[PDB]
Amino acid sequence: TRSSVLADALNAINNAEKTGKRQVLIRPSSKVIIKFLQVMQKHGYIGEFEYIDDHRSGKIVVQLNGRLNKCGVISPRFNVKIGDIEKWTANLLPARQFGYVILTTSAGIMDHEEARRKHVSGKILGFVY
């Protein structure tokens, strides 16, 4: 049974890109998926996306460009202690100058750079590059 609804949304996006597609249907969407989708978008890693309203949990159509190598999820949402943020980005980003660890914090779902700027931390959602 569906354990992470986010996990499906990322792996879907990932398989689209890999296969050269320019869009994906995803199912079933969530507040969290949207916000994660939103961060990637803000940073260019996908185009526009549309929420279609089945009278249920939602579907999403993402339009993706091809700037995307990987968008991954972090399966237990481990707590990060703001100083540990460095250790995550390093572990799992390609270089120190681009790419993002995106994570959930009391002050919103935000990438680590915004997290750094706002001086907050929390739990780790996933990543983009």
Partner: protein, 144 residues
Amino acid sequence: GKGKPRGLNSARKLRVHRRNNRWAENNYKKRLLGTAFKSSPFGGSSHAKGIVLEKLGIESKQPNSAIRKCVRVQLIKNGKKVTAFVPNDGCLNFVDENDEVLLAGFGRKGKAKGDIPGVRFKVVKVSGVSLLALWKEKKEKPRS
């Protein structure tokens, strides 16, 4: 995920499971079972001193043909009996029955050396002096 838990609360399962599986580590299990202290002719200690019971001529393994000079030694703190090799040319002439000798391991973590069957130790001293010195003739075997 194949096969380990990934959950945020599966820490206990993950420790236990490790503990359980460490017992497949040959070094780990000997450490905790206390094999050293229990079996093993030395205490678990680096050398041991014993007494020379008889001089053996151990025939070497294939593909090698030789007589490997050795000694049966009874460990002083132990009475455990052990056969040990007497390194270098001659040197068997430097020992004698009832002589005191200082045995050490063969650097092989237990386990026999090369073509010598059974032997896991080598002689380092006799009557308080050391082969090496006697061999290179910079010292002499003591009176009695």
